[PDB]
Design a protein around this ligand. Sequence first.
Ligand SMILES: Nc1ccc2c(NCc3ccc(F)cc3)nc(-c3ccccc3)nc2c1
Length: 325
Amino acid sequence: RPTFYRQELNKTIWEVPERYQNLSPVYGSVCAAFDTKTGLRVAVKKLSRPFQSIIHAKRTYRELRLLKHMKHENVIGLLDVFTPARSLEEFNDVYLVTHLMGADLNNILTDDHVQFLIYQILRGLKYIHSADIIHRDLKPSNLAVNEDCELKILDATRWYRAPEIMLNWMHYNQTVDIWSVGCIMAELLTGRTLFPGTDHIDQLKLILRLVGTPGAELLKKISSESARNYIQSLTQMPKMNFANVFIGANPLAVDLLEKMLVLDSDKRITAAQALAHAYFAQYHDPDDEPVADPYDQSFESRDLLIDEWKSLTYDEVISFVPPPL
Ligand SMILES: Nc1ccc2c(NCc3ccc(F)cc3)nc(-c3ccccc3)nc2c1
């Protein structure tokens, strides 16, 4: 049990172990800090109102469980989790400590940079997807890149969302993330957002303008009559030739985009399949693209009181084991 020191940052009081020094500000508030134990720069996130409602309390619990499970080089992992509280009764504040990453992918490329960056994302997604976890919100601001161009996955928003999440299909799979990667890859190659839509309707028109309106083989798999009516109403756009839209790009890169930006998610390439694509021949190492331990998601289907979620979160703070140096 370490000793804590109080401090006021951006009109909030931070109580953190003395082990973390020189706090500097950057869902919750985040501070950069120096960690005297590892000698490394860290990010300390103080959650805001972590147990205000059932939804917050479950969301706090979910976030701690996910971070505690991620042990992979291209996914953000948990260095430490702590509370100033000495008991469950006083437990009201949760802090999360992770590696401070240099910048996000948003604020920044040759084809070799794009290969390395997209390769690291797919490698992280393979790990995440193997544990039955879907990210659902992949976008450049959720991708941290240091000076070495080493990338970690963290955590408009609509520009990277899969068409089946736009239409609220209840049974989408992991490939909603592959769609996002496709949109990201296309932005890195061209400098431009692929689908910069102003709202949900406009967003889908821009998508269908590139990938074409869906054929009868995809229509026969849509369960919502209203969605089916809507889709068939809109004007028939032809599938464009990616080799023309992405003119001058590496043709292996165009080929991967065509396999990622597929409307039908049953036919969209997976992260593991994409890792073996020729586009990543330089980097692909099948002996060095691990999968994750199983992840118990059964709590997602539970309806519990705020104090029960809080209690379950307290247990996970106590049982936390720091990763090895
Ligand atoms: N097996 C599959 C494969 C893809 C599906 C899918 N793709 C999203 C989509 C978006 C736009 C469009 F024009 C055509 C399809 N949506 C839906 C769906 C279901 C209910 C409500 C809305 C979308 N079910 C699917 C089932």
